Design a protein around this ligand. Structure first.
Ligand SMILES: CC(C)(C)C(=O)N[C@@H](C(=O)NO)c1ccc(-c2cccc(/C(N)=N/O)c2)cc1
Ligand SMILES: CC(C)(C)C(=O)N[C@@H](C(=O)NO)c1ccc(-c2cccc(/C(N)=N/O)c2)cc1
Ligand SMILES: CC(C)(C)C(=O)N[C@@H](C(=O)NO)c1ccc(-c2cccc(/C(N)=N/O)c2)cc1
Ligand SMILES: [Zn+2]
Ligand SMILES: [Zn+2]
Ligand SMILES: [Zn+2]
Ligand SMILES: [Zn+2]
Ligand SMILES: [Zn+2]
Ligand SMILES: [Zn+2]
Lengths: 516, 516, 509
């Protein structure tokens, strides 16, 4: 629990914001058939024009204001088009001779907005929210969205609107001012109301993960991350257990302990459990990779474009699992028992570091020949997967920033999923659809298994077969003997390079998985 | 004060030679309008021939010896030319039937010798001093030189003549420095004052050279700071060495972070010279003091990164200390100078700061580390804050900051940056009179936006923009709020790659700045 | 004159747009005193706050009650003045006519730099590209001098314009409100000329190497010369051989396009008191030769820009031919060719002879610019001029010294250098003086030839290259502008047309 320091100026905890301005926003949903009141703040219409490549803007909704309705007549609106992402601001006086602000966001010509399309729409909305000191936002849905896409709209809105200033000091934005009210006008309003607070939970689960990932390695270390996990568990009334080095040695986790040998921070194994109130029909282990910093070890990340300054992300999997723990602990699903696992450590260069060539013994007895110290994720997961299977669960799902090869296979939008079981894989893909976090199924090619045959050990850590994501999956598979297991590689999608911030990818995916 | 050791064979101090053979050379300046007597040792004429490429050598000076005068008749000398760097040796008997040695050095056809050509002249002269066991050197100036260039001649003569053998064991058994130096020149009385000034300037440069040439196992933060104290005590300068505890109390998080991975504690050097009368100008001299730059986790592993030379990375501190010698010795009036250096070592360890880390400077600004090898500006940041807190008129820092300097100005000219044109003008003026060439480079504000960090107040390094020297200057500028400041990047000029030794660059420049 | 083809589908000319939509824009300048009329179109206020990202406050009186209500302090303080930040709203004015009103933030500094003004303009152009307006009205509530005001217009015109020559609704009126408007009006038509000179250069640079080759580029120079009544002469291989331009001819040996030396001349009507030669590097594509640009990050796909010096000179020729300066004779020169890999290419190690008799040992075929410039400078000095100014994308080292914003200037004459620096100030194309360090000269000493092409190296490539060029100007005031870093706008993925206005201001002032 006590974080070691080199100097007294070294931080000893991760700064975490639990009460965000988003949580202070009163959200109301009204039915669009009842007409819209356009009074205070900014009122935005989400409008499209089917079969028309940049068609004219037409406001269909009834507006309970003669002056605003007059401004919004088609003859007035025809100068504007519905091109996806396009937005405009309107200034006018309402029936009470009060100044009001009105506008729209273009939703293109396609009647079915993709996950990318809605995100593009949301981003345009946030630009209107930025650099403007509004007290209220009102969104009028003149497009067709189902419950899932509606929830996605809110989640994405909350997440992008929120700004992380935990590490700002002399450069805090002096103009930041969050809205206090959110009004939503939509068709079939009663069906969508339940999605509001679920979206708020999914938001924070994601933002919490984001906070952990964005936190630098001097703030976010194996000890401070594990302390934060306990703190979260206490708040959610979850059972929790943090395994220290002596306990890990007792469990003979030689692979996990080897990676952390060169670190000044002791290894900390996070084990959280949520158990439903009643009959448990499904037991699930969620495993997250928890490398608080990946220097690469003695296989140092020194090659051009290895982005070592980014390697604080290497605990993104752990964050996804912890963010899911928040959502599950808050929404409290029934008939499920969930274990949240993460073998947390740091991969550093030291006199005490494990070397390339070292042979290490996993907790299941298998000896492993280390061919590359920068492939440390699969080593820590190996011991974690063995621990997971001993819990006696039905499904083991691990999520990890495992291989850079994902950038060349799926890129920055789609995570890849591997597994030994098609049913579990199908559930993950189903969860991908409903959570709107895109995942693609990649194969575990058994023909490559022979490249992991070590001359001296039971198995090689790496091949020496480019195909890194597949080989890594073959490695991990060796540590699950008779349990349905799935592996999600998020090395490519975890970090948003365009926005220079984490995505908190996987939180919504895993929560949808546990709930459904 | 006590230097830590790994083994008992690790050195515990920097070997320093204070009394050099150069100091034992008796120097006499005579007026040439009285004629030259050629008796013992070597007598060298510095001769040119204006507007006539490689024209004949002609000795204009009167020689108070009939045979030598006859030997040196124009008819005899016409077979030799005045090409720059050319030297010749003559053997003859004087009026007392004694064997004497005479020769010349060609000084070209240009009437105004450059700083570079004069250096070539000196080297040709020093070559004659080498491999010859002379008791006296006599130099006759038959060229036109002002007081500054004459002083430059002596400094360069002294510095190049001197040989550093502190680390020889086996040492040249055949070395034998002269005990007397005679100079014949017109208006000798005006030039006599330059002799002891040159000797002071010489050692300031050679002292700096000794610190730079000293390897990092000899020259470490503790041993270097100890040396500064010892120097300060000999000069009666006020001195204060700030240790880790004061630095923590002063909240120097940037400086302390760089040294975290080192076995040697950070040591902040603070020397002060105060005049006896009224103080009209207060000056802070800041030197980069990285005793070894491994690059940290951004290891210098790239081809041609020249990590074995990186003991020079404390050249700025050495330059400042060399200046402290000159100022403390010459004792200028009406000035108060603070000699500063945030000394530490940039190493790879379990305790090292990582890429991505956010650290807080002593002025409260948070800094996101994008590259651990850009450590100089971090130590300078806290040092510059400390300097401004002293309430001075001018802040000048000198540092081996950016490798880009080799591509901009190369190895002869250092670059100067600043926030104040007047100060820049003073630095440039000092460059002329000290003959240490410096060129003014711009701080381009358009690049400042690339230092915008998403999470911290500022980025340590840029991403988009090359031109590191300007970007680094933009960084440093953020740590000086309302004081005239200039920054001299000597990364390119500090080491003499051809001669394989330091130049001690900056000592004479800074002293002239302080004196004038 | 005839462009050679490999297949019949290969283009034989550079598509050039002479009549741009910008030329159809009616520009009106009114004095800010007396109030602003908000009638049609979009009205944008340029506002600052002398604090850091302070609230927007509109000082100007607006002769419209509805718009005045919009611009009241209570409404505008919700917005801040962060440089580049903008908001615009659509509303009805007193005449129930649709109008759009907004601002662009100009920061807290009272004196906007050229880079600052560029960010303001870019924010403005984004609104012009996303709005179907017939009229733009810009209200200057900031301090701008005549030069910077002209710069505003030029940059606005340039950024507004879109190059669609290779693809397979602009405003018609521009209103400007500014204090002391009468003093600023003369800058308007000057800006329009400077605009096209820059845009013309941009068109040549942006044109790919299959369109823009030595033949088609020289043809373009003739066509321009004919429109401007400039004297013109294009030297072909046979003339160049008789002139013994061996350095220049060696570089082009490996190309399928014959070398073409462009020589345009502007001569004043009255007495010629000053003669100036402008030399531009004209490499239509730089593959690097046998020293191929194959290293990671060598950006070989960008190397069509390597004729930017020539384009700058030609764009300047337009401005000079249009504005018609007095008492000057200007020669516009470019040794145009292509640096390719072939059985006929010159090899690393080859010793070649320049037109002044100097033999040169080639150490790197990718340092071809200085070879073509060498013969061009000899040709220039033979004309008997007062000033020789060359402009070239010469060394990549400029990216490490001054970066992408400031060009570097080198020279053998201090008066000429300051004139260029003065021109840099008034044209707002930033240039910084870099030294020609004579101590590095010895590194060009060849064992076999008279001189080395490159050092081996004294890293500082930009300085070493200047020393090389310096050897080919014997008794003439000469200056060299390295634009390798500033020529291409990597962020916007387009040329800057850098140097046209700089060179024009030099000739005019
Ligand atoms: C097989 C290899 C050691 C190359 C590997 O896959 N290493 C991963 C690792 O460090 N596991 O612990 C690895 C390497 C790179 C990345 C990664 C992730 C995201 C972005 C990038 C990136 N931008 N590289 O330029 C690189 C992720 C995982
Ligand atoms: C931002 C960057 C890492 C490029 C940088 O400025 N590095 C300097 C540094 O480590 N500061 O602490 C840096 C890099 C190289 C040099 C340097 C200086 C002198 C010679 C050489 C050289 N010849 N390397 O092969 C390299 C000096 C400073
Ligand atoms: C002496 C050397 C071959 C290194 C050189 O300066 N070559 C220049 C050249 O090709 N002259 O004909 C040269 C090299 C690189 C560049 C340049 C310009 C802009 C960008 C880049 C680059 N590498 N972007 O990633 C490189 C410009 C001129
Ligand atoms: Zn790794
Ligand atoms: Zn990893
Ligand atoms: Zn460094
Ligand atoms: Zn350094
Ligand atoms: Zn080239
Ligand atoms: Zn080129």
């Amino acid at each position: 629990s006590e974080v070691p320091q080199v100097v007294s100026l070294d931080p000893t905890s991760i700064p975490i914001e639990y009460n965000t301005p988003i949580h202070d926003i009163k959200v109301q949903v009204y039915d669009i058939k009842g007409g819209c009141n356009v009074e205070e703040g900014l009122t935005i219409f989400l409008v499209n024009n089917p079969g028309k490549e940049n068609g004219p803007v037409k406001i269909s909704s009834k507006v309970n204001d003669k002056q605003v309705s007059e401004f919004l007549k088609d003859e007035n609106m025809e100068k504007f088009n519905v091109k996806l992402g396009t937005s405009k601001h309107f200034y006018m006086f309402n029936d009470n001779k009060n100044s009001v602000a009105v506008g729209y966001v273009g939703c293109g010509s396609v009647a079915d907005l993709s996950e990318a399309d809605m995100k593009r729409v949301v981003l345009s909305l946030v630009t209107m929210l930025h650099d403007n000191k509004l007290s209220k936002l009102t969104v009028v849905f003149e497009i067709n969205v189902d419950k899932n896409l509606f929830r996605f709209f809110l989640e994405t809105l909350f997440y992008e609107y929120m700004t992380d200033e935990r590490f700002k000091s002399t450069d805090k934005n002096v103009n930041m001012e969050y809205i206090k009210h959110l009004g939503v006008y939509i068709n079939n309003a009663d069906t969508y109301k339940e999605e509001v607070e679920k979206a708020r939970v999914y938001y924070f689960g994601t933002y919490y993960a984001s906070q952990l990932i964005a936190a630098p390695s001097n703030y976010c270390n194996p000890v401070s991350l594990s302390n934060a996990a306990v703190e979260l568990a206490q708040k959610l009334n979850l059972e929790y257990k943090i395994l220290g080095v002596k306990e890990l040695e007792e469990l003979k986790m030689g692979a996990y302990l080897s990676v952390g040998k060169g670190s000044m921070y002791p290894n900390k194994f996070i084990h959280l459990t949520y158990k439903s109130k009643g009959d448990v029909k499904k037991k699930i282990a969620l495993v997250g990779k928890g490398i608080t910093f990946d220097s690469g070890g003695y296989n140092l990340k020194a090659a051009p474009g290895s982005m070592i300054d980014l390697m604080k992300f290497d605990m993104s999997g752990c964050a996804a699992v912890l963010g899911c723990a928040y959502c599950v602990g808050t929404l409290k699903p029934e008939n499920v028992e969930i274990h949240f696992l993460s073998a947390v450590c740091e991969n550093m260069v030291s006199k005490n570091s494990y070397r390339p060539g070292d042979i290490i013994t996993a907790s299941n007895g298998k000896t492993i020949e280390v061919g590359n110290t920068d492939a440390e994720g699969r080593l820590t997961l190996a011991d974690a997967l063995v621990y997971a299977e001993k819990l006696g669960v039905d499904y083991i799902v691990d999520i990890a920033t495992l291989t850079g090869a994902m950038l060349y296979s799926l890129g920055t939008s789609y995570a890849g999923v591997f597994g030994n079981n098609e049913e579990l894989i199908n559930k993950i893909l189903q969860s991908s659809k409903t959570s709107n976090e895109p995942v693609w199924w990649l194969p575990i090619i058994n023909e490559y298994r022979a490249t992991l045959n070590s001359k001296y050990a039971d198995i090689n850590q790496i091949s020496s077969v480019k195909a890194s994501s597949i080989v890594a999956s073959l490695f991990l598979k060796e540590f699950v003997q008779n349990t349905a297991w799935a592996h999600i590689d998020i090395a490519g999608v975890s970090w948003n390079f365009k926005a220079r911030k984490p995505k908190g990818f996987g939180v919504r995916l895993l929560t949808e998985f546990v709930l459904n």
